[PDB]
Each structure stands twice: as structure tokens, then as C-alpha cells.
Amino acid sequence: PVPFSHCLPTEKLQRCEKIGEGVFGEVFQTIADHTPVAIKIIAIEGPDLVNGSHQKTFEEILPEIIISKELSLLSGEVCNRTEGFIGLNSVHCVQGSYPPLLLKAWDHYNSTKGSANDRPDFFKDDQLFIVLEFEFGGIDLEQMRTKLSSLATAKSILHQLTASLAVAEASLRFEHRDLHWGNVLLKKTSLKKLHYTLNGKSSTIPSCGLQVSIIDYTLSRLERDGIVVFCDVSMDEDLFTGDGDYQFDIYRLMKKENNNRWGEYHPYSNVLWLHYLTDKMLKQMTFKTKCNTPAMKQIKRKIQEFHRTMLNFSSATDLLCQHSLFK
Numbered sequence: 531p532v533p534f535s536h537c538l539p540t541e542k543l544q545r546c547e548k549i550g551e552g553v554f555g556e557v558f559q560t561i562a563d564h565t566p567v568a569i570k571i572i573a574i575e576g577p578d579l580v581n582g583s584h585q586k587t588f589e590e591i592l593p594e595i596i597i598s599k600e601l602s603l604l605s606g607e608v609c610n611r612t613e614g615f616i617g618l619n620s621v622h623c624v625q626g627s628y629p630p631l632l633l634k635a636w637d638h639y640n641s642t643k644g645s646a647n648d649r650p651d652f653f654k655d656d657q658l659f660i661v662l663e664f665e666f667g668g669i670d671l672e673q674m675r676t677k678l679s680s681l682a683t684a685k686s687i688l689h690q691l692t693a694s695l696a697v698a699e700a701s702l703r704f705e706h707r708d709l710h711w712g713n714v715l716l717k718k719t720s721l722k723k724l725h726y727t728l729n730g731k732s733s734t735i736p737s738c739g740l741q742v743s744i745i746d747y748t749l750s751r752l753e754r755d756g757i758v759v760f761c762d763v764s765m766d767e768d769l770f771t772g773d774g775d776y777q778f779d780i781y782r783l784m785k786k787e788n789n790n791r792w793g794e795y796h797p798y799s800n801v802l803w804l805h806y807l808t809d810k811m812l813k814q815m816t817f818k819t820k821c822n823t824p825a826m827k828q829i830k831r832k833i834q835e836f837h838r839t840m841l842n843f844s845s846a847t848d849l850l851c852q853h854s855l856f857k
């Protein structure tokens with residue numbers, strides 16, 4: 531292991547601002563070489579509860595590391611190519627107490643947005659962490675609830691998500707398994723069209739000025755050459771007992787689909803998450819401009835039709851290739 535200063539030299543540490551959190555740990559934004567990055571910091575291997583939960587072991591965090599690398603690499607592949615995941619810049623194992631400068635950033639977020647986490651100030655100098663440095667992907671869909679232009683933008687977002695998932699199905703037999711709206715990031719792009727390649731066939735998606743990135747592979751599954759990497763939640767109690775959001779039904783519906791066998795490949799889980807996201811677009815997102823052109827009112831009807839038909843498709847690949855929304 532390395533000190534925090536290896537990943538976060540002084541200027542980079544000084545520029546850290548907290549941008550997100552979960553039970554897992556903390557997410558900061560910083561800048562180096564004029565380019566923003568997101569730094570995800572996860573405590574591992576220790577005996578303390580953190581945010582009310584036990585810390586993962588190194589063996590338990592390896593799947594996320596592996597999957598983050600494989601999905602990042604899809605941006606540079608040929609037959610199955612997409613930029614719709616997030617870039618992975620580096621992964622380090624760090625040892626030390628939490629940097630005071632990160633505690634300062636943590637406090638500022640707590641003061642302004644509020645935190646559900648413990649202040650991470652109780653770690654000793656032998657504590658291990660995994661520090662994942664990603665591309666900065668933009669702002670999550672949940673925080674953009676009231677910020678998008680119109681349902682035209684929603685269509686682009688759903689198309690981008692579907693295409694990315696299809697490319698990952700095709701290359702990696704990938705299932706995200708936790709694609710809630712905090713895990714869909716939106717960044718401005720000057721590109722009018724985005725490009726992907728699925729089993730050697732290239733196509734484009736009108737961007738509506740945004741590039742989508744799918745993040746957070748903590749529950750994800752994939753395989754290469756018959757070796758499966760996944761999170762076995764078969765004995766998890768709490769994952770399947772949520773309520774108050776369709777999100778929590780998706781965990782139950784995944785478990786029904788896979789008979790509680792999480793190592794198997796069930797790409798229908800990607801369709802379930804896409805349905806949950808379409809449902810958010812129609813029910814919880816609110817747009818600056820409502821549909822008032824015949825072209826826009828047709829777009830709304832088409833997204834409604836997607837919502838009521840998409841659960842009859844077997845995978846994100848099937849949706850992309852066969853659904854009328856994308857023709």
C-alpha cells in the first residue's frame with residue numbers, strides 16, 4: 531500500500547470537493563492537468579463499522595475493480611465499442627488516517643447538502659482504503675430532475691443507456707444490477723451524434739447536447755472465457771425489503787428472474803433497470819419545456835409506448851436492435 535499523498539499530492543488534495551456518498555464511502559471531485567476527475571474512496575479490511583455497515587475485504591472489492599476496468603476498456607475496443615460507461619484512470623490501495631483536507635471537504639458538504647455518513651475521522655494510520663480515480667462523468671440524473679430541456683433529451687438518454695448496456699451484454703455478458711438514477715451521469719457535449727459499435731456494426735445516436743455515463747459497478751456481473759465476476763447477494767436480507775420507490779421492486783424482480791442464482795447471466799435485469807429509468811423519465815423528471823410541437827408530442831407517445839412494451843424484450847441488445855423507439 532501507498533500513502534494518500536501518492537494519489538492525492540498536495541495541489542490535487544487542496545482542490546478536492548465532496549460530490550457524493552453512500553454507505554460504501556465517499557466521492558470527491560478534483561482536478562489535475564486541467565481536467566476534472568472523480569475520486570471514490572472505500573475503507574477496506576478493518577473491524578470498524580463505517581456508515582453502519584462492515585467494511586469489505588480486498589476479495590470483496592475486487593469485483594468492482596475488475597468490472598470498472600473492463601467497462602472502461604470498451605471505449606477503445608473495435609467490434610463492441612462504447613463510451614457510455616465511465617473511464618477508469620487508476621486504482622490504488624492506500625494506508626493511513628483520513629487526510630485532514632478531505633475531512634474539511636467532507637464537512638463543507640455536510641454543512642451545505644447534509645450527509646447520512648459518519649464523519650470519516652476515526653481511522654487509524656494502519657487503515658486500508660481502495661482509491662479509484664475515474665473520469666468525471668457530469669451530474670446524476672436524480673440531481674437533474676428539474677434541469678433538462680424536454681422529453682427529446684429523455685429519448686437520447688434512454689437510447690444512450692440502452693446502447694451501452696447492449697454493447698456490454700455482447701462483449702462481457704454484463705448486467706449492471708443497480709442502475710438507479712444516481713448512477714446515470716449527464717455531461718454537456720458539443721458532439722451532435724455519439725458513436726457505438728455492436729458486434730461490428732457501427733451506428734450513431736443524436737446527443738441532444740448530452741453524453742451519458744453509467745457508473746457504480748458494486749452489484750454488477752460479467753464474464754470472460756467462462757470466468758464470472760459478480761456480487762453474490764443471495765443471502766442479503768435488506769436488499770430485497772425496500773419500499774417507497776420502484777427502485778426497490780427492481781431488486782425483487784431481479785431475484786424472481788434469476789431464482790436467487792446471481793452467478794447466472796440474466797440480461798433481462800438490464801431491461802428491468804431500463805424500465806425503471808423510463809418510469810422515472812415519465813413520472814418524476816420534470817422538463818423546462820413540455821411537448822408542444824407535433825414532433826415532440828409524438829416523442830412523448832413513443833416513450834410511453836416504450837414503457838408499456840419494453841418488459842417484453844429479453845435484453846438491452848433485443849431492445850436496441852428491435853424496439854421501434856430506436857428506428
Ligand SMILES: Nc1ncnc2c1ccn2[C@@H]1O[C@H](CO)[C@@H](O)[C@H]1O
Pocket residue numbers: 549550551552557568570616664665666667668669670712713715745746
Ligand atoms: N465518475 C463520477 N463522476 C461524477 N460523479 C460521480 C462519479 C462517481 C460517483 N459520482 C457521484 O457520487 C454519487 C454516489 O456514487 C453519484 O450518484 C454521483 O453524484
